[PDB]
Amino acid sequence: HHEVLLRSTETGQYLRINPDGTVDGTRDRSDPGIQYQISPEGNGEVLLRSTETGQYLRINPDGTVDGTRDRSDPGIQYQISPEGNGEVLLRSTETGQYLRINPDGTVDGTRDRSDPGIQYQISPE
């Protein structure tokens, strides 16, 4: 299905959207909530849709991260920005916040371009 995994370059943790719409990080490569489809929006924007539950990764204005079913719900548009050597940043267009996965497996938004938790590998399933 051309699914991809979104993996922290820092810790190797995978971004997971859970059936309850919560989002966190896990090392469990077998978890069904870590597969995504990149949804082209055009103009350099994409949505990141969890395949198991059809939810889009959302970064909320308050800096919290969760999932949503509704593609018009803002906060779900991203710019995938290559850094080099196959590492990328995932920048939410609405607010300009980067998607951050922290070493403890919590996931939130940040503007700190230097934070080690905003770098990802995107790999084919």
Written description of the protein model:
The chain has a single domain (1-125), classed as Trefoil (Trefoil (Acidic Fibroblast Growth Factor, subunit A)). It starts with a strand and ends with a strand. Helix content is 0%, strand content 50%. It has no helices and twelve strands. The chain has strands spanning 4-8, 14-17, 23-26, 35-42, 45-50, 56-59, 65-68, 78-84, 87-92, 98-101, 107-110, 119-124. The strands form four sheets. A six-stranded antiparallel sheet has the order 5-4-1-12-9-8, with no helix packed on it. A two-stranded antiparallel sheet has the order 2-3. By secondary structure, the protein is mainly β.
Structural features:
monomer; 125 residues; mainly beta; Trefoil (Acidic Fibroblast Growth Factor, subunit A); six-stranded antiparallel β-sheet; two-stranded antiparallel ribbon; 12 strands; 50% strand; de novo protein; simplified protein design
CATH topology heading: Trefoil (Acidic Fibroblast Growth Factor, subunit A)
What topology, given as strand order, has the largest sheet? Answer: 5-4-1-12-9-8
Total discrete domains: 1
Run of helices and strands = EEEEEEEEEEEE
Distance between the termini: 9 Å
The appropriate CATH architecture is: Trefoil
Major sheet characteristics: 6 strands, antiparallel
* Content-based structural category: mainly beta
